[PDB]
């Protein structure tokens, strides 16, 4: 596909992302996020939620 | 007469983990692990060669399926499972070393 | 919120920078809007450095303490607009961006009053100056070769979003009796695009 | 929170406070009103934004294929490759987990800190003119109109102006 | 594809009540991720926020100190709209009124009052002057030809003009209105066309003055 | 501790306090008595328990043998294996050291925080009825019997009940 | 700083304070004077020194050459070596960045903590004899000569000695 641009490739396609990690393919090549086992690692961007 | 300090909260927060607790609900959270794949080779801005039926090592010897790849130029080279290096049967000694060289060749 | 400059002209392709000076500095809370004539403001930059949805890459924002800047890297004819910054609920006074483009002389047309309007007891004569640049122009009315004064109004369009020209209308208003008392109606136009003034005219009842 | 303000002595958050992270809610003859504090809100926002700038970035190192998905490499070298890759997967999964846990702890404590700082800043402002309630409220002894409340928020409040009336009211 | 559609009268008598409505489509008046605002604009005062309403497990309203004593903004969850009500109007309330969504766009969940979508605007005039209809006269063409329509003596603004029911847009110029010494407005709309098309193509200007409920078509011929 | 309560203004710990982490020690006409505070104690316990739940766990990745202890593999590949393993040993030893150091810093500061939070909670309770000693003690001006001391611990204490007597005693 | 003293309510640092990290600046009938506090200064120094003792050290692991710069090894094994080395380079570069960022955050917050601790220690000392200014200053109501100021710094200050004069001055 010459309509999208990406630098991380694997057999199933292209990982387009600015995230530090990925859980798509441990054998991805090019310039990639580092593969991790976990499906999700949520980073807090706000305070503790204390609802009424 | 009195004045009171506070902070905002939301009915539907987002759960995260800390060093000290699992599933702490916070106002905001942003995912750090990418799960979304694009099911295409995104090749904008790169000279791309999709070898298809031609095996990478066939570009050097030239079985009929590689006739259009005998002098290719590329930033990105794509091998496919159906690619074959040969017509008359056989194989290269040190085949993967040679593949690694040709993959980086341009 | 205080903007500088209040207005500016620039040629197509120019780098344009507009500034907002704020009472108090908060990057997150300062946003920019573009408003074209007769339309609502559209949000271009939000949080100071973030581009609005649908906003082309030539627009960018920067912030530093209490000073915030909007930049158009290469100006385009369609960017003719008034720009307002905003912090919390207060909007800067706005910066009018006008385009400087090559000189173009007006095409001039004169329209006599309709036979219908005349029956109402008034006559209106309109001189059209079409698609010219820059805005400065003089329009003078002559009735049987006598210079008119104080019986005409002008209206001018905003810059055209495609060719960056202006158009102008001048309307001379007379009573039917005054209109019928004279023969030659002439509109004389001075614009720096013309080698000398152009005059369009008609003769009454012709 | 480490400081004990958010989810601490401040009982709970305000869903109505949509314009800010931290804010003021007052009670006086003129009624009730709520207003966000942007200086504290911006400090928290700037710091979270800083973390994201750090974490969302380039690992410029580019890695080539060293094995083959279609025609498998020799089994000895293949096993070494897989062992090494799986070891790296283990390291990075551990690193990512610990990074996010550490950052989240700090992010929560950071927000709690900013809330505390705002509270203490106000307490110092109206020294001897009011007393700590314990719910994050300051009971003010003198009459404090909306202009007086807005002076507290603004940080211009002058305690000496109302000290005789407030002190004598104890 | 959120769309804010504005309605309400553009003429209010001094001391009486201005009433406007914004009807939302593509989003919910009671959405957690929206704030519904009114803002006005005048050549004098510039852009001025008036107030808002929003739902966060209960309805909230905030208003600008300048209008707080006169203003009410209420949601209608049956018609997915919200209103503006301004009591005791004075000539200083003459302005274009816009509805606008904010707080859809946020920095880490904090409404930063970015107004991401606006209504089309309602021009409101505070005056005790009764509305008047606009007379429409042809500006007749006498290889490019210009023709037009003179839209004369109406109050208040605005008038809209199209050509051939909107089928003709290229080369059209509708001039801003001028206030005449009579205290009534006037404007012209003009178009340039190939002079050859005069003998075959019909040219009709369509003039709409919503304050007087006037819709008039005028054929313009040589 | 970061807050400066434990090993700070509180001179030292109580060996007699065997039932809790944090507690109260009083002096009044009726004598002396010591009691642990479970809410603060439980908060600290729950948080340490959380760390242990995180650190004592499965690395599900299973690693096979890639060399041989009885019949040594080729020397080139063997050296690559050993270099890679020793590199991993270095990474993990570093990771473990830093993890434990970081967690220990936080654990100590966390305990110090909970102590401070309890102190400030009490200070707010008896506002204008007592004064900070500086040893983590509150000198109470009015007469406070065991039921009065137990009301402070319990958190029901009502300062307005004893304010006239206590305030006038200054 | 997390506590909000350094670059917080204390407006700015003193370039003249060359002998210490933290110190006192007074105003009284006798004039003005500045003096460093070594106990707080030493605590901060000892803690930073501890970090450096940890970070400046031996990795006893010794690594041999596994490739060759003059006569390149086989290309397959060479690529495995390079991939593994580059993976380690990536891990260590990430580790170093995060270590320094984490330690720097803590170092800044630590210094801010020590400043706060010193301030609160003084506040407790002269309870009911002075009031918090809000700039990190204590307005003292009674007359306090250089021997009185030096008693505050020294930590011997006796508030009961000057309490009648100071309290009555409100
Ligand atoms: C924590 O803060 C983050 C911001 O850091 C915040 O995330 C934001 O979420 C909204 C969605 O709710 C994102 O907005 C999108 O923007 C894209 C263009 O960039 C639009 O195309 C999207 O439109 C969709 O929805 C529209 C109707 O609402 C449709 O008309 C359209 O067809 C699309 O379906 C959408 O507006 C925004 O990008 C993020 N911000 C960032 C930086 O990514 C998040 O919500 C916060 N968390 C919580 C729980 O509030
Ligand atoms: C190295 O690991 C890969 C997978 O990461 C192994 O290849 C897979 O083997 C499974 C079943 O054993 C097959 O169904 C897949 O097609 C293979 N996946 C890929 C991506 O190739 C490979 O066997 C391992 N190497 C060795 C020497 O055992
Ligand atoms: C790889 O490392 C192992 C040890 O971890 C080396 O094998 C040991 O060698 C010592 C003396 O050199 C022997 O006494 C031990 O019996 C060996 N231990 C084991 C566990 O095998 C081995 O020599 C190293 N590989 C290479 C190629 O040098
Ligand atoms: C492994 O990496 C080394 C460099 O780290 C590669 O060797 C270099 O190659 C460049 C150009 O490709 C030469 O100019 C240098 O002289 C080499 N440097 C050193 C230190 O040897 C080597 O090619 C890589 N291995 C493989 C198999 O490609
Ligand atoms: C702070 O707010 C008040 C409103 O009571 C205002 O009068 C005052 O001018 C503000 N302070 C400054 C420095 O503008
Ligand atoms: C707290 O303890 C006291 C003992 O003095 C007891 O009488 C009181 O009932 C307790 N509070 C509650 C809410 O039970
Ligand atoms: C503390 O300093 C003062 C100076 O005013 C001195 O007289 C006093 O002896 C010192 N304290 C001690 C315990 O030495």
Task: Summarize the model shown.
It is classed as immune system. This is part of a larger assembly, with two copies of chain A, one copy of chain C (206 residues), three copies of chain D (170 residues) and one copy of chain E (222 residues). In chain C, 5% of the residues lie in helices and 51% in strands.
Question: What is the strand and helix layout of this fold?
Answer:
This is part of a larger assembly, with two copies of chain A, one copy of chain C (206 residues), three copies of chain D (170 residues) and one copy of chain E (222 residues).
Chain A: E1 8-10, E2 13-14, E3 21-22, E4 29-30, E5 34-35, E6 42-44
Parallel strand pairs in A: 3-5
Antiparallel strand pairs in A: 1-2, 1-4
Chain C: E1 2-4, E2 7-11, E3 16-21, E4 30-35, E5 42-46, E6 50-51, E7 59-64, E8 67-72, E9 81-87, E10 90-91, E11 95-100, E12 107-111, H1 115-119, E13 122-132, E14 138-143, E15 146-147, E16 152-156, E17 166-175, H2 176-180, E18 184-190, E19 198-203
Parallel strand pairs in C: 2-11
Antiparallel strand pairs in C: 1-3, 3-8, 4-5, 4-9, 5-6, 7-8, 9-10, 9-11, 12-13, 13-17, 14-15, 14-18, 16-17, 18-19
Chain D: E1 22-28, E2 31-37, H1 38-55, H2 75-125, E3 130-132, E4 137-140, H3 146-154, H4 159-167
Antiparallel strand pairs in D: 1-2, 3-4
Helix pairs in contact in D: 1-2
The structure holds a molecule of 4 linked components (NAG-NAG-BMA-MAN), a molecule of 2 linked components (NAG-NAG) (3 copies) and 2-acetamido-2-deoxy-beta-D-glucopyranose (3 copies).
The site of one 2-acetamido-2-deoxy-beta-D-glucopyranose (NAG) has 5 residues of chain D, from helix 3.
Disulfide bonds (chains D, F, G): 144-148
Subunit structure (chains D, F, G): Homotrimer of disulfide-linked HA1-HA2.
Family (chains D, F, G): Belongs to the influenza viruses hemagglutinin family.
Could you characterize what this model shows?
- Chains D, F, G: It is found in: Host apical cell membrane; Virion membrane.
- Chains D, F, G: It comes from Influenza A virus (A/turkey/Italy/214845/2002(H7N3)).
- Chains D, F, G: Belongs to the influenza viruses hemagglutinin family.
- Chains D, F, G: Homotrimer of disulfide-linked HA1-HA2.
- Chains D, F, G: Disulfide bonds join 144-148.
- The structure is cut from a larger assembly and holds two copies of chain A, one copy of chain C (206 residues), three copies of chain D (170 residues) and one copy of chain E (222 residues).
- Chain A has 52 residues and is mostly beta strands.
- Chain A is built from no helices and six strands.
- Chain A has strands at 8-10, 13-14, 21-22, 29-30, 34-35, 42-44.
- In chain A, the strands form two sheets. Chain A has a three-stranded antiparallel β-sheet with strand order 2-1-4, with no helix packed on it.
- In chain C, 5% of the residues lie in helices and 51% in strands.
- In chain C, the strands form four sheets. In chain C, strands 2, 4, 5, 6, 9, 10 and 11 form a seven-stranded mixed β-sheet that branches. A four-stranded antiparallel β-sheet of chain C has the order 1-3-8-7, with no helix packed on it. A four-stranded antiparallel β-sheet of chain C has the order 12-13-17-16.
- Chain C is elongated and about 70 Å long.
- Chain C starts with a strand and ends with a strand.
- Chain D has a two-stranded antiparallel ribbon. Chain D has a two-stranded antiparallel sheet with strand order 3-4.
- In chain D, strand 1 and strand 2 (31-37) form a beta hairpin.
- Chain D starts with 21 loop residues before the first strand and ends with a helix.
- Chain E is 0% helix and 52% strand.
- Chain E has strands at residues 3-7, 11-12, 18-25, 35-42, 46-55, 59-63, 71-72, 75-76, 81-86, 95-102, 106-107, 110-111, 115-118, 122-126, 135-139, 144-154, 160-163, 172-174, 178-179, 185-194, 204-209, 214-219.
- In chain E, strands 2, 4, 5, 6, 10, 13 and 14 form a seven-stranded mixed β-sheet that branches. In chain E, strands 1, 3, 7, 8 and 9 form a five-stranded antiparallel β-sheet that branches.
- In chain E, a hairpin with a 4-residue loop joins strand 8 (75-76) and strand 9 (81-86).
- The chains are: A mainly beta (52), C mainly beta (206), D alpha+beta (170), E mainly beta (222).
- Chains C and E meet through strand 5, strand 10, strand 12, strand 13 and strand 16 of C and strand 5, strand 13, strand 15, strand 16 and strand 20 of E.
- Residues 69, 75, 78-79, 82 of chain D line the site of a molecule of 2 linked components (NAG-NAG).
- One 2-acetamido-2-deoxy-beta-D-glucopyranose (NAG) binds next to helix 3 of chain D.
């Amino acid at each position: 596909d010459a309509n999208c641009e990406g630098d991380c490739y694997h057999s199933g396609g292209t990982i387009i992302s600015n995230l530090p990690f990925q859980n798509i393919n441990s054998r991805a090549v090019g310039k990639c996020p580092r593969y991790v086992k976990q499906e999700s690692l949520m980073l807090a961007t706000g305070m503790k939620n204390v609802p009424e | 007469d009195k004045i009171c300090l506070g902070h905002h909260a939301v009915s539907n927060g987002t759960k995260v983990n800390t060093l000290t607790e699992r599933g702490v609900e916070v106002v905001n959270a942003t995912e750090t692990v990418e799960r979304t794949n694009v099911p295409r080779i995104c090749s904008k801005g790169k000279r791309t060669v999709d070898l298809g039926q031609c095996g990478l090592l066939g570009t050097i010897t030239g079985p009929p399926q590689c006739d259009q790849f005998l002098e290719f130029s590329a930033d990105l080279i794509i091998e496919r499972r159906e690619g074959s290096d040969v017509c008359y049967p056989g194989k290269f000694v040190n085949e993967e070393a040679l593949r690694q060289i040709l993959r980086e060749s341009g | 919120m205080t903007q500088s400059p209040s207005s500016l002209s620039a040629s197509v392709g120019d780098r344009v920078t507009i500034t907002c000076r704020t009472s108090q500095s908060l990057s997150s809370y300062t946003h920019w809007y573009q408003q074209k004539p007769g339309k609502a403001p559209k949000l271009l930059i939000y949080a100071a450095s973030s581009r609005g949805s649908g906003v082309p890459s030539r627009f960018s924002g920067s912030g530093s303490g209490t000073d915030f800047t909007l930049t158009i890297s290469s100006l385009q004819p369609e960017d003719f607009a008034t720009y307002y910054c905003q912090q919390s609920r207060t909007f800067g006074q706005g910066t009018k961006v006008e385009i400087k483009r090559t000189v173009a002389a007006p095409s001039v047309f004169i329209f006599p009053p309709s036979d219908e309007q005349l029956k109402s007891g008034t006559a209106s004569v309109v001189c059209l100056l079409n698609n010219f640049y820059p805005r400065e122009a003089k329009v003078q009315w002559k009735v049987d070769n006598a210079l008119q004064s104080g019986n005409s109004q002008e209206s001018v369009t905003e810059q055209d979003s495609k060719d960056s020209t202006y158009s102008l209308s001048s309307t001379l208003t007379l009573s039917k009796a005054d209109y019928e008392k004279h023969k030659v109606y002439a509109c004389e136009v001075t614009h720096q695009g013309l080698s000398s003034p152009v005059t369009k005219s008609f003769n009454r009842g012709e | 929170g480490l400081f004990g303000a958010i989810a601490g002595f401040i009982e709970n958050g305000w869903e109505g406070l949509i314009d800010g992270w931290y804010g003021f809610r007052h009670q006086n003859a003129q009624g009730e009103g709520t207003a966000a504090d942007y200086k504290s809100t911006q400090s928290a926002i700037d710091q979270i934004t800083g973390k994201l700038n750090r974490l969302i970035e380039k690992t410029n190192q580019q890695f080539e294929l060293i094995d083959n998905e279609f025609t498998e490499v020799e089994k000895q070298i293949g096993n070494v490759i897989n062992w090494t890759r799986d070891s790296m997967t283990e390291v990075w999964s551990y690193n990512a987990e610990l990074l996010v846990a550490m950052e989240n702890q700090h992010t929560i404590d950071l927000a709690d800190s900013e809330m505390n700082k705002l509270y203490e800043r106000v307490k110092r402002q109206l020294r001897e003119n009011a007393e700590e309630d314990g719910t994050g409220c300051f009971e003010i002894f003198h009459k404090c109109d909306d202009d007086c409340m807005a002076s507290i928020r603004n940080n211009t409040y002058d305690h000496s102006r109302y000290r005789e009336e407030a002190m004598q009211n104890r | 594809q959120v769309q804010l559609q504005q309605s309400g009268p553009g003429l209010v008598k001094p001391s009486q009540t201005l009433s406007l409505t914004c009807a939302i489509s593509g989003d919910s008046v009671s959405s957690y991720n929206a704030v519904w605002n009114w803002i006005r604009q005048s050549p004098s005062r510039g852009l001025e926020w008036l107030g808002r309403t929003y739902y966060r497990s209960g309805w909230y309203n905030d208003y600008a100190e300048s209008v707080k004593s006169r203003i009410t903004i209420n949601p209608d969850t049956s018609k997915n709209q919200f209103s503006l009500q301004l009591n005791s109007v004075t000539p200083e309330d003459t302005a274009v009124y816009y509805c606008a969504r904010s707080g859809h766009i946020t920095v880490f969940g904090v409404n930063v009052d970015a107004f991401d979508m606006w209504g089309q605007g309602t021009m409101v005039t505070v005056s005790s002057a009764s509305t008047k209809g606009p007379s429409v006269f042809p500006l007749a063409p006498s290889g490019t030809a210009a023709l037009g329509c003179l839209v004369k003596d109406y109050f208040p603004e605005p008038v809209t003009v199209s050509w051939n029911s909107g089928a003709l847009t290229s080369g059209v110029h509708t001039f801003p209105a001028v206030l005449q010494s009579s205290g009534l407005y006037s404007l012209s709309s003009v178009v340039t066309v190939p002079s050859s098309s005069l003998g075959t193509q019909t040219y009709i200007c369509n003039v709409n003055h919503k304050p007087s409920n006037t819709k008039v078509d005028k054929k313009v011929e040589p």
